[PDB]
Design a protein around this ligand. Structure first.
Ligand SMILES: [Cl-]
Ligand SMILES: [Cl-]
Length: 162
């Protein structure tokens, strides 16, 4: 199990523009296109992102290409963030995956706002961090994904994904 397989499980794969749980236009493996309500403004961003006239549809290859960038972008934002980096360096490989997962779904800024949880993870207080992570809009909105991420932090294993 690795971050790519983990995220492919949490996000799924769609070759046509679709709306996320939050109602935003997305494509491929969890690639947010735009928060704008316009389907044309999504189709625009999509064509810009791919380099071609897609008419809202992409190939598997194109999807994995966006996935590689977003994962790379996710990790790099973590390493660039003063708040996130120290937490990441302090974690093992599995838990590192879990933090990358969060950043991919919610953005560096969003994750950076989980001040108390991060602090608890940095101090290795697993059970407590798990409780604090669940008191969030995040958990309430995507509860099954969130429990899986939370379990990963709590246990330090890939069980939630097996
Ligand atoms: Cl892009
Ligand atoms: Cl969910």
């Amino acid at each position: 199990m690795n971050i790519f397989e983990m995220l492919r499980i949490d996000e799924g794969l769609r070759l046509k523009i679709y709306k996320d749980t939050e109602g935003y236009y997305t494509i491929g493996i969890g690639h947010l296109l735009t928060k704008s309500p316009s389907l044309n403004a999504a189709k625009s961003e999509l064509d810009k992102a791919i380099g071609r006239n897609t008419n809202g549809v992409i190939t598997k290859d194109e999807a994995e290409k966006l996935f590689n960038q977003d994962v790379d972008a996710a990790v790099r934002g973590i390493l660039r963030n003063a708040k996130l980096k120290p937490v990441y360096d302090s974690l093992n490989a599995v838990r590192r995956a879990a933090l990358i997962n969060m950043v991919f779904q919610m953005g560096e800024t969003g994750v950076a706002g989980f001040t108390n949880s991060l602090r608890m993870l940095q101090q290795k207080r697993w059970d407590e961090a798990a409780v604090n992570l669940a008191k969030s809009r995040w958990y309430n909105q995507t509860p099954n994904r969130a429990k899986r991420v939370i379990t990963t932090f709590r246990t330090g294993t890939w069980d939630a994904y097996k």
